[PDB]
Enzyme design. Structure first.
Site, PDB file in Angstrom:
ATOM      1  N   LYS A   1     -17.133  -0.656 -27.605  1.00  0.00           N
ATOM      2  CA  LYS A   1     -18.294  -1.122 -26.867  1.00  0.00           C
ATOM      3  C   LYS A   1     -19.477  -1.550 -27.759  1.00  0.00           C
ATOM      4  O   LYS A   1     -20.211  -2.412 -27.354  1.00  0.00           O
ATOM      5  CB  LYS A   1     -18.807  -0.052 -25.882  1.00  0.00           C
ATOM      6  CG  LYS A   1     -17.909   0.262 -24.721  1.00  0.00           C
ATOM      7  CD  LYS A   1     -18.004  -0.847 -23.675  1.00  0.00           C
ATOM      8  CE  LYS A   1     -17.312  -0.449 -22.390  1.00  0.00           C
ATOM      9  NZ  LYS A   1     -15.811  -0.587 -22.416  1.00  0.00           N
TER      10      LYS A   1
ATOM     11  N   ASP B   1     -19.002  -1.533 -16.511  1.00  0.00           N
ATOM     12  CA  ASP B   1     -20.327  -1.002 -16.850  1.00  0.00           C
ATOM     13  C   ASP B   1     -21.321  -2.135 -16.925  1.00  0.00           C
ATOM     14  O   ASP B   1     -22.140  -2.143 -17.817  1.00  0.00           O
ATOM     15  CB  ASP B   1     -20.391  -0.228 -18.201  1.00  0.00           C
ATOM     16  CG  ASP B   1     -19.533   1.047 -18.237  1.00  0.00           C
ATOM     17  OD1 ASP B   1     -19.148   1.554 -17.167  1.00  0.00           O
ATOM     18  OD2 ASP B   1     -19.311   1.553 -19.380  1.00  0.00           O
TER      19      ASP B   1
ATOM     20  N   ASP C   1     -17.762  10.268 -25.841  1.00  0.00           N
ATOM     21  CA  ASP C   1     -19.020   9.511 -26.014  1.00  0.00           C
ATOM     22  C   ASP C   1     -20.186   9.900 -25.104  1.00  0.00           C
ATOM     23  O   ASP C   1     -21.285   9.482 -25.293  1.00  0.00           O
ATOM     24  CB  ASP C   1     -18.783   8.005 -25.983  1.00  0.00           C
ATOM     25  CG  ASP C   1     -18.238   7.510 -24.674  1.00  0.00           C
ATOM     26  OD1 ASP C   1     -18.299   8.235 -23.668  1.00  0.00           O
ATOM     27  OD2 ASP C   1     -17.758   6.360 -24.662  1.00  0.00           O
TER      28      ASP C   1
HETATM   29  C1  LIG Z   1     -22.020   5.182 -16.941  1.00  0.00           C
HETATM   30  C2  LIG Z   1     -21.125   4.624 -18.033  1.00  0.00           C
HETATM   31  C3  LIG Z   1     -19.853   5.456 -18.199  1.00  0.00           C
HETATM   32  C4  LIG Z   1     -18.935   4.938 -19.325  1.00  0.00           C
HETATM   33  C5  LIG Z   1     -17.486   5.183 -18.906  1.00  0.00           C
HETATM   34  N1  LIG Z   1     -16.322   5.062 -19.842  1.00  0.00           N
HETATM   35  C6  LIG Z   1     -16.306   5.947 -21.024  1.00  0.00           C
HETATM   36  C7  LIG Z   1     -17.038   7.273 -20.901  1.00  0.00           C
HETATM   37  O1  LIG Z   1     -16.459   8.068 -21.926  1.00  0.00           O
HETATM   38  C8  LIG Z   1     -16.848   5.072 -22.140  1.00  0.00           C
HETATM   39  O2  LIG Z   1     -15.977   5.227 -23.244  1.00  0.00           O
HETATM   40  C9  LIG Z   1     -16.883   3.623 -21.656  1.00  0.00           C
HETATM   41  O3  LIG Z   1     -16.435   2.618 -22.583  1.00  0.00           O
HETATM   42  C10 LIG Z   1     -15.995   3.731 -20.462  1.00  0.00           C
HETATM   43  C11 LIG Z   1     -16.072   2.516 -19.546  1.00  0.00           C
HETATM   44  C12 LIG Z   1     -14.772   2.669 -18.797  1.00  0.00           C
HETATM   45  O4  LIG Z   1     -14.468   3.787 -18.386  1.00  0.00           O
HETATM   46  N2  LIG Z   1     -14.019   1.574 -18.693  1.00  0.00           N
HETATM   47  C13 LIG Z   1     -12.710   1.601 -18.066  1.00  0.00           C
END
Ligand SMILES: CCCCCN1[C@H](CO)[C@@H](O)[C@@H](O)[C@@H]1CC(=O)NC
EC number: 3.2.1.169
Length: 681
Positions: free
Chosen positions: A164, A241, A342
């Site tokens: 990211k 996100d 993270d």
């Molecule tokens: C509110 C933002 C949450 C982010 C959620 N996830 C992970 C949390 O560990 C993080 O690594 C981020 O890249 C990811 C986004 C996500 O889950 N995509 C499928």
């Protein structure tokens, strides 16, 4: 041997055959040359000639193995492996199959000796691997090179690159080609992935500022085209996100289909095309909208759609995968957000992989793990995910964890096990996701503490278990610090190893305070404990100082609360007994806070001093720092300053008051989500 992953079918005979001194190699010129290179390393020192034991290697259809065609399973990446005293067969259904046979073959080899064995194997899930998809410092180049060798060894065929915080992956510079240096590195990565039979999937995350126009469409394709020139043959578009226009399901589908028709189907040799939706888990899916069924109906069916489960962080269940598959009209490609840390960056997550249904292989297109920014440390979970995804029906959580640890660190496996089993829970977090920790000693710890708290006699066995454990913990820390077999692993975990050692020393000294039979000795241990608390705080403030969850937490679930509460209790008992006024605080805090909130402790985080996050007007709160500092601001979510306590100075909120470097020692508020003083370090 504990073959990992475990093959689909295995028959073994109590008979070993030496790795032949003299071999005839049949099919070295036609078999997967990555598989042949592995075989030839395993056979260095042995003689090649047309005499002696036949070794048959090739892909189904090759003359080398046409003999064994009906034994070769008819699955992608399947293989047949046979060892008897007559010959060895290493026959893939495809080239990757043959490479995978060699990975199993290498595990069977011991001293120069092979078991007499027959294996038919293939993966139950088509795409298996890792998505580097976390917030934080992206994996170094060297860590990536090492990852890809590890994926080949454990038959993971997929690495999705999407850190990211890589500015050329995300906004706004997703539009720019990588600079020469990084591009040269990605090119090496792709070549190395190719040598280890891993699909390098390059992802792009254009969504936060994408315009739905010709101009951004073309730049996205131009960027893909650049990546293709670097060797990339698989691609992903992530819309996770983000807010704004980029969340539009119709437009996302149209763009992926455009990529699919004008690029992925026009090149001769593009493998996976994958997208991450904006609604990527059930809890963020809006039944008021139609986002997922629109993707489901509009997105070309060969395109994968990613899914994290029922929540942002969740385990994958039958009901959950069924829920999603019905909407997206294809089997979900699981993005499993473990062991990604993270959002709990002060914890390492080194526990076993568990919680994912082992019967639902047919319901998923792929399974990838999102790991920690600690690459080597993530291998425990990665090794395990590879085992699970190859053969879920036989997935043994605990044995795979142990095999992972024994693979990653053979010289100090029991010490890593010790460390890892007390460094697995995440602690409280906004996603509600927790893992077990310290389970073997949790009952002894619970009985001891309840007995001791109540004045009842604790069981001696329980007390010795706690003793044993703290002793073992120190030995493990010390050995791990000096281990030179996996230096990059030890660099990653070192701050936690120091903190774990201190946790164990504190525990020993607290148990001596419990057993302590005179005042003087008790006092020496008390003072020692306080010093160890202060050392833990120092490590907490000087290691792992990221902006989000700085510091170093370890053994949080069971061990630390036990030591904290045991110390509080025994000091309370000592005070009653000797009419003394020893302080029973369990975490060192150099700054003080008083109120009429009272026992919400202060915390130090970087250059912030905050009250741990109750709307009664009892009337006031004061913070005293340990020195005078220049002040930056005070932040509050539901006010005066001084340097001596005596002269005050009001500041006006907005809630946020600027201090403008005004010297600060004391902060008072008169007449809670946040209450934070920022000072200049
Ligand atoms: C509110 C933002 C949450 C982010 C959620 N996830 C992970 C949390 O560990 C993080 O690594 C981020 O890249 C990811 C986004 C996500 O889950 N995509 C499928």
């Amino acid at each position: 041997v504990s073959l990992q992953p475990p093959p689909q079918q295995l028959i073994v005979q109590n008979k070993t055959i030496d790795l032949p001194a003299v071999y005839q190699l049949n099919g070295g010129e036609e078999a997967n040359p990555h598989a042949v290179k592995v075989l030839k390393e395993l056979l260095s020192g042995k003689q090649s000639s047309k005499k002696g034991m036949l070794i048959s290697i090739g892909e189904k259809g090759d003359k080398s193995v046409r003999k064994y065609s009906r034994q070769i399973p008819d699955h992608k990446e399947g293989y047949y492996l046979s060892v008897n005293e007559k010959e060895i067969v290493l026959a893939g259904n495809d080239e990757r199959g043959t490479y995978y046979a060699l990975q199993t073959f290498a595990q069977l080899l011991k001293d120069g000796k092979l078991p007499e064995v027959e294996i038919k194997d293939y993966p139950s899930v088509r795409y298996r691997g890792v998505v580097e998809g976390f917030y934080g410092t992206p994996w170094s180049h060297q860590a990536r090179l090492s990852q890809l060798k590890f994926y080949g060894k454990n038959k993971m065929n997929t690495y999705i690159y999407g850190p990211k915080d890589d500015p050329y992956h995300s906004a706004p510079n997703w539009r720019l080609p990588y600079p020469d240096k990084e591009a040269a590195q990605l090119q090496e990565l792709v070549a190395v992935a190719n040598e280890n039979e891993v699909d390098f999937v390059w992802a792009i995350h254009p969504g936060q500022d994408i315009k739905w126009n010709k101009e951004d469409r073309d730049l996205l394709l131009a960027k893909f085209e650049k990546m293709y020139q670097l060797g990339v043959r698989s691609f992903a578009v992530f819309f996770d996100d983000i807010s704004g226009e980029g969340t539009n399901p119709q437009k996302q589908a149209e763009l992926l289909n455009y990529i699919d028709e004008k690029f992925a189907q026009v090149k001769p040799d593009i493998n996976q095309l994958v997208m991450c939706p904006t609604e990527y888990n059930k809890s963020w899916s809006n039944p008021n909208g139609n986002y997922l069924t629109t993707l489901g109906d509009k997105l070309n069916p060969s395109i994968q759609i990613m899914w994290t489960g029922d929540r942002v962080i969740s385990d994958i269940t039958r009901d959950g995968i069924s829920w999603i598959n019905e909407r997206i009209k294809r089997p979900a490609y699981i993005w499993w957000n473990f062991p990604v840390s993270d959002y709990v960056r002060d914890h390492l997550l080194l526990g076993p992989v568990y919680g994912n249904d082992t019967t639902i292989a047919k319901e998923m297109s792929g399974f990838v793990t999102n790991p920690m920014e600690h690459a080597e440390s993530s291998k425990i979970a990665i090794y395990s995910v590879a085992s699970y995804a190859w053969n879920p029906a036989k997935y043994d959580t605990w044995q795979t964890w142990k095999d992972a640890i024994r693979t990653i660190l053979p010289s100090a496996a029991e010490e890593l096990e010790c460390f890892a089993m007390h460094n697995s829970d995440l602690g409280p977090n906004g996603h509600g996701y927790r893992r077990e920790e310290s389970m073997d000693i949790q009952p002894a710890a619970e009985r001891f503490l309840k007995a001791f708290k109540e004045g009842k006699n604790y069981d001696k066995a329980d007390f010795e278990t706690l003793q044993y454990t703290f002793e073992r913990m120190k030995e493990s820390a010390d050995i791990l610090l000096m281990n030179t077999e996996n230096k990059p692993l030890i660099v990653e975990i070192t701050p936690w190893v120091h903190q774990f050692k201190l946790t164990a020393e504190m525990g020993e000294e607290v148990l001596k305070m419990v057993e302590g039979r005179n005042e003087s000795y008790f006092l020496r241990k008390y003072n020692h404990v306080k010093a160890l608390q202060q050392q833990m705080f120092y490590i907490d403030q000087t290691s792992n100082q990221n902006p989000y969850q700085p510091g170093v937490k370890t053994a949080t679930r069971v061990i630390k609360p036990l030591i904290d509460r045991t110390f509080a209790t025994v000091v309370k008992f000592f005070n009653q007994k000797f009419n003394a006024h020893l302080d029973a605080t369990t975490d060192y805090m150099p700054h003080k806070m008083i109120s009429n909130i009272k026992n919400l402790p202060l915390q130090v985080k970087a250059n912030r001093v905050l009250i741990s996050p109750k709307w009664a007007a009892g009337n006031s709160v004061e913070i005293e720092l340990d020195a005078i500092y220049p002040g930056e601001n005070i932040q509050i979510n539901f006010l005066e300053i001084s340097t001596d306590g005596k002269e005050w100075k009001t500041v006006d909120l907005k809630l946020s008051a600027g201090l403008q470097k005004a010297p600060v020692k004391f902060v008072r508020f008169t007449n809670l989500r946040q209450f934070v003083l920022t000072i200049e370090k």
